Every structure is written in C-alpha cells, then in structure tokens.
Design a protein around this ligand. Structure first.
Ligand SMILES: [Zn+2]
Ligand SMILES: [Zn+2]
Ligand SMILES: [Zn+2]
Ligand SMILES: [Zn+2]
Ligand SMILES: [Zn+2]
Ligand SMILES: [Zn+2]
Ligand SMILES: [Zn+2]
Ligand SMILES: [Zn+2]
Ligand SMILES: [Zn+2]
Ligand SMILES: [Zn+2]
Ligand SMILES: [Zn+2]
Ligand SMILES: [Zn+2]
Ligand SMILES: [Zn+2]
Ligand SMILES: [Zn+2]
Ligand SMILES: [Zn+2]
Ligand SMILES: [Zn+2]
Ligand SMILES: [Zn+2]
Ligand SMILES: [Zn+2]
Ligand SMILES: [Zn+2]
Ligand SMILES: [Zn+2]
Ligand SMILES: [Zn+2]
Lengths: 159, 158, 155, 158, 157, 158
C-alpha cells in the first residue's frame, strides 16, 4: 500500500535531515568555541545517518522502493545566538523524529504490517532515551547559563 | 577572496552530494541483487561523507564560515538500467569532484593561500587514485558484461 | 637575496616566539596559574623545535644561517590578567603565520619548490595553533566574567 | 677468455633488457586495467634485475671486467593489442634469455671454466621453471580469451 | 601540454639512468676493493629504480602515457681513478636530477597541474637530503684522502 | 636583596647565551660536514637551555623576579676556521659560565642565602664535569688535527 511506502521514504529523509541539523549544531558550537558540545553534535549527526541507512537497508530487504529526496539546508543556525537556542532546536528536532516514527508505526498497524512494527520497536525505545537525554542536557544548560562563564566551565568538563 | 570562501563552501556541498549519489548507487545495486557492488558503493558513500566533514573541520579552524546547503535529490538512478550505467555515472561523479577540487586550488593559488593549498594536496592525490580505481572497475564491468551472467560471477568474487 | 634573508629571519622569529611563550609561563607561574604556566612552557619548547627545524633544513640546502640576537619579550610588563597574556600569545601566533606566508611567497616567486614543500606542514600547523589559542582565549574571556571562576579551570 | 668475457658482459645486458621488457609489459597491462597481470610482470622485472646483479657480482669476484651497456628501449609493446600478445612476447623473451645462458655455458665448457659452469647451473634450472610457468599462463590466457570477458574474470582471480 | 607529458616520461628515464650510474659506481668500487662504498652505491641504485617505478605508477594512474626509453650506458666510469672522482660524479648526477625534478614541477605549475605538484613534493625534499648526504661524504673523502691509506678507514664503514 | 636577585636574573641570560653559542657551533660543524661534532653541540645547546629553565623555575618558586633579557647574537662563529677554534671557544664559554655560577654562589654566601647555595651545588659539580669533558675533546682534536684527514676519521667514530 502506498501510504506506508510514502511514510517509509519520508522517514529516510527525516533521519538524514536530522543528521544535517546535528552537523549544523556542531559547526555553530565549533565556531563559537564549545568544542565538547560540538563533538557531541558531530557524533549524533553520524548516528542519525546510521538510522537513515538502517531504514534504507530494511526497505531494500522488504521490497519497499526508496527514492532518495533532497536533504534541505538547516536554517536555525542563522538565528542561534547561545548554546541554549541550539539545544532547544535539537530537542524540537528529536520530538519531530519521534512523531514521524509514531506516524510510520500507526500506518503499519493499520496495514497489519507486523514486520515493520517489529522493525520499529527499537527505534521507539531509542527516541525515548534520546528525548530524555536532550531534555536533561537542556535543563543543565539553562541552569548553568544563569551565571556568566559557568556554562563554559562545564563544556570543558562534561562532553 | 569571497570567491575562495564560496568555493570552499561549495566543496562541502559537492562531497555531501557525492555521498548521496553513492548511496543511490548502493540502493540501485541492492534492488537488483548486486550485493557486492552495493557494499562497495555504501563504503564510498561514508568515505565521501568523511571528506566533507574534513573540509568542514578545516574551514572551522581557519574561520572560513560554512553554511550547509541542501543536498539535492540524486537523479541518475531514474535512468540506470545496468551495472555499467551506474559505474559510468560514478566515474563522471568523481571526475566532477576532481574538477571542483582543482578549481578550489586555483582560487587558493591566486590568493596565495598556502595553507589551503597544503590542505588540498592529499585530496588531489586521493582523486587520482579514485578515478583510476573506478576506471579500472568500469573496464572490467564493460568487458565481463559481454557474456550473459558472467558479470554476476564477479560481484560474488567481491 | 630576499629568500635567504627571510629564511634566516624565520629562525629568529621562531626563537623570539619561544622566549615570548617562556615569558607568558613566568607571568602565569608568578601569579599562580600552574596549568597555564605548564602549557606556555611546552609551547616555548615547541617554538624552539620549529626554529631548529628551519636551521636543519637551511644547513641541508646550503642556505647560510647566521644566528641573530633573540630579542627580549616586551609584553609581560603590561599583562594584568590571563586574558592579556592569551591575547598577546594569539597576536604572536598571527605574526608568525604572516611571516611563514611571506616566506612561502618569496619561495613561490623564486620557483623554490623544495622550500614550498618544506613549509607546508608549518602552514597547517599554524592554522591548528591559531584555532587552539582562539578557542582558549574565548573560554578565558567568558569565565573571567565571574570572580574566581577562571581559577576553577586552570586547576 | 676473450669470447667468455664478452659473453659474460652481454648476459648482464640481456638480464637488464629482460627487466625492462617485463616493465613494458606491466605498463601495458596496467594501462588496460589488467592489475593482476601487471603486478606479475612488475615482480618479474625486479627478479630479472636481480639476475643481472648476480652476474655482475660474480664477474666482480672472478675479475671479469664488466662495462655496463645501454639497456635498449622495449619495442614489442608497440604491437600488443591483447593480453595474449604480451604473454607471447614474454615467452619469446625467456626463450632468448635461455639461449643466451646456454651459449654462455658453451663458451665456459670450451674454456674448461668449471667455476663459471657451476655458477650458471641454478640459472639453467630456473630458466626451465620460468619457460614452463609462462607456457602454462599463455595456454590459460589463450583458452580463456575465447569467451568475451572470461579472461577478465581471471586477472581478478589469479 | 606536450611539454608536461614529455617531461614526465623523461623523468622516468632520468631515474633509471641514475640507477645505472650508481650501479656503475658500485662496480668501480668493488673492482678497486672499496666494499663499503660499493654496497652504499648498490643500495642507492635500487632506490633510484624505486623512484623511477614511482613515476611510472603515478603516470599509469593519471593516464600520462609512458613509453620506456633506452637507459644509456654510464659514461663517467671510464675515467674514474680514485674514490673522490666517483663521489664527485655522483654529486653531479644528483644535482642534475634535482634540476630535472624542478623543471618538471615548473611545467606542472604553468599548467596548474596540482596533482603532479603534490606528487612531486616528497621527491623535492628527498633530493635536498640526498645532495646534502653526498656533499658531506665527498667532503670527508676529499679530507681523508690527503693521507695515504687513511681513506680505507671510511670504507670499513 | 638587590645584587643577588640581579645576578640570579642574569644567570638565566648566561645559560641561554651559552645555548645559542652551542647552537652556533653546531651550525658551523654542520656547514663544514662534521655531523658528529654538530650533533654533540646541538645536544649541549638543549642542555644549556634546560639549565636556564631550572634557574627560572627556582626563581619563580623563591619569588626572585625574572625579567628575560635579549639573548646576544653568537659572534665567535665569524672567526672559526677549524674544529679546534670552535672547541676552544666552547671551552672558554664553559669556563665563563663556571665563573658566573661561582660569583652567584659568593653573593648568596654573603647573604646567608642557604637555599640558593644548596640549589647551586649540583651546577658547580656539573661545571667541573663539563670543563673536563671539553678539555679532553679539545686535546684529542688538537692532537689528531696534526695529520691531514685524521680528525675526520674520528668525528665518524666518536
Ligand atoms: Zn574546531
Ligand atoms: Zn543519540
Ligand atoms: Zn534517528
Ligand atoms: Zn535522533
Ligand atoms: Zn540487501
Ligand atoms: Zn574511495
Ligand atoms: Zn570526496
Ligand atoms: Zn570521491
Ligand atoms: Zn611554580
Ligand atoms: Zn613556530
Ligand atoms: Zn607557534
Ligand atoms: Zn594501476
Ligand atoms: Zn620468475
Ligand atoms: Zn633472467
Ligand atoms: Zn627470466
Ligand atoms: Zn665484491
Ligand atoms: Zn631519484
Ligand atoms: Zn637520487
Ligand atoms: Zn647536516
Ligand atoms: Zn649551563
Ligand atoms: Zn654548560
């Protein structure tokens, strides 16, 4: 059925888009001397690409034809002015990855596609851990940034 | 030297664009049961991604501002009907990557940007190896494909 | 020949920079920034190795070297905080980058491909050092906004 | 003496001429994307040069004056249009290296030069092994080349 | 251009010519019982051949057509009489090959051939180290040969 | 007090001055193809700089203000024309540095500065060893330089 095929392709695009947006965050961090937060975003960019590639591989195995779409330019970088803005956009990015996965799971449930649902399970649990972790980092950032220089003092350690 | 900063940015785009094209080739091979050619392309896709990241890292160190551009949808895949069409497209892709590196070096030379020229030196030599390698694979593919089934034999001898 | 002049001058620049890093190490130590002082001391040794590297290449290439005086560092009398020191160190490295580029430009006019090849790893090294220094100065300047917080990070 | 000193010098030229012909073959193979055959010819070029050096070293010990001659430009490479042509020329090169050693041994025998004859023994036996190996490769080449693409699938293997 | 391709092809001939001239030096040293110097020249003959093979390999990768030329017979050897004569010819051989590399780089530079320039960099630096090493052996040889027999000491390396 | 703190400050200049003059000797030897003597001088150059840095470190610890002075250009190198000239200058350099440490210890002695005197003890014993070592190399050099070529054939050994 075509909607499942459509949503499956859209997931690939969403993971590669997340990959670029994480890469954009690394660059912002780096240009602004937050080497540790830049390292973390770089590692996450590589991880989102791996998610994308796992969907491509599953799709190839299951005969779901994939046609790669444009990966848009990240644009939030234009307006980030502190680490708190960057981490807030990364949280929103991950909340969007979770919504597209839940959409995909909903369509497969409708279609009684037990294999796609089994395939998605570890991704549902990984988004739980990912949102939890970003939420935690954002809480620390917005707390420590209430004292000048304190946040920097902790890029240096943690990350 | 706005020209240099522009060519440096576009170089990131070209490496990430090549990564996507290699990924599209890996998908087309996979869908047509060329698993060995698919893993080869998938490896090259990750490697093009690493090149781009290496440009980004250098640009960050040298205060060359990077803004990531869209990576366009690959479109050669619509038209491939055999492994030879894919490998031909990958050859032309690398020849465009080579051209683009050489343009960027020309711009660096003109600016006397010696750091940029030194940074590019190993990429120039890498392109020489990459085109040679593809050229040789395309020669073998084009020869073996003259007998039905024989090319299939050598996907597996990989 | 401007190329020989400049090559012999690069030796002096490296040893000059070695002494400026040693001066920074002294100011840090005297003001109880041991971490920062350790760091400048290791960079002082490193500049000296760059100078020895130019002397060795020149000897091999028959570029006559005559050692000049190594000028006294002048910036230390003015430094009042770690920000002043790291700022002067950034300028010192910028000056050295400029001087390696002018050397490479003379070598390029003369078609001296060997000297150009010899300089390549130095050009790339300067890019990494200016980046590292810029990044440390950024942290210093941010952390110094809260009394005593910078100390937390030397240590 | 005379005849023996001249032939011993000529043998040095012959080994190094052979080294260069093998190198010409490696280049032709490489330019036409036969990497495995190319590697084999490169490995043989180095080994011919070693034979050459072995003669020089023996001559030096036995006070035979060596004057190094021009090593001629390889010319068969102008004519090669497939792998079979290259292997054929290599087989004929080795049959002439064999002739040259046998002629040397002949002059040594006449002069009753037992040390020279002892020195050449392993080379005569090595020529037997070389002509046999090349004959056998040329047989396989000319058999595989009867199906388009098949030869290529076996540069890749062997 | 014609020129850059002619020069690359010739550079192979240059490295193989240097290989034979080092072989000719080893032979002269061996015939004159300078075993240590003979072994040095023999190892340098192999290395020049490796340089030539390095150019051939690059040329194949880069589609620069190579046709091997004759490697001329070594000439200096007929007139060497003492180790100083040999070392001086070897220095001159190395100086010539440095000029031949700089001329190739210049041709590559005119054509904006960045790949050939990059490929050449380690060879330019290698020449600097070779000329230096030979110049220094030659200074020692011409100093020790002032006392009869003493230079036999350099040889027992 | 003033005189002691000044002499301590200027001991740093004397060590760094000695470092540069060793470096200059290493350059003269290298330029004249005495690589063995050049390596020896280079290593002593690094050692004189470590002695300087030992003074700086102790001064930092004992709150003796250090103001780094110009390190003078070495000038003996303009008149050196044989290895014996270089080694004789190096000997005078070390005798000068010994006198310079003894004066420092004498000022510390008048000041009852037991810490400085303890700090200096191993430097005094090091100067003894260095003078003896250089005296000994100089005697060998002067003796061997009586026969042309002979000194050369001992840079090579050592
Ligand atoms: Zn960075
Ligand atoms: Zn993650
Ligand atoms: Zn994901
Ligand atoms: Zn994610
Ligand atoms: Zn598959
Ligand atoms: Zn690759
Ligand atoms: Zn690339
Ligand atoms: Zn590529
Ligand atoms: Zn201290
Ligand atoms: Zn430096
Ligand atoms: Zn530096
Ligand atoms: Zn090849
Ligand atoms: Zn063989
Ligand atoms: Zn042979
Ligand atoms: Zn043979
Ligand atoms: Zn011998
Ligand atoms: Zn060479
Ligand atoms: Zn050479
Ligand atoms: Zn030297
Ligand atoms: Zn000392
Ligand atoms: Zn001393």
């Amino acid at each position: 059925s075509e909607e499942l095929l459509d949503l499956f392709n859209r997931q690939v695009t969403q993971e590669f888009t997340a990959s670029q947006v994480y890469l954009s965050a690394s660059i912002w961090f780096d240009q602004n001397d937050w080497e540790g937060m830049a390292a973390y975003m770089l590692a996450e960019s590589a991880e989102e690409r791996e998610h994308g590639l796992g969907f491509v591989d599953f799709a190839n195995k299951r005969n779901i034809p994939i046609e790669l779409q444009a990966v848009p330019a990240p644009v939030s970088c234009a307006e980030w002015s502190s680490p708190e803005d960057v981490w807030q956009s990364i949280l929103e990015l991950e909340q969007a990855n979770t919504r597209s996965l839940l959409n995909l799971a909903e369509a497969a449930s409708t279609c009684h596609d037990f294999a796609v649902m089994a395939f998605l399970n570890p991704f549902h649990l990984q988004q739980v851990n990912e949102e939890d972790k970003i939420g935690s980092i954002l809480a620390k950032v917005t707390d420590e940034n209430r004292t000048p220089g304190l946040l920097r003092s902790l890029d240096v350690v943690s990350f």
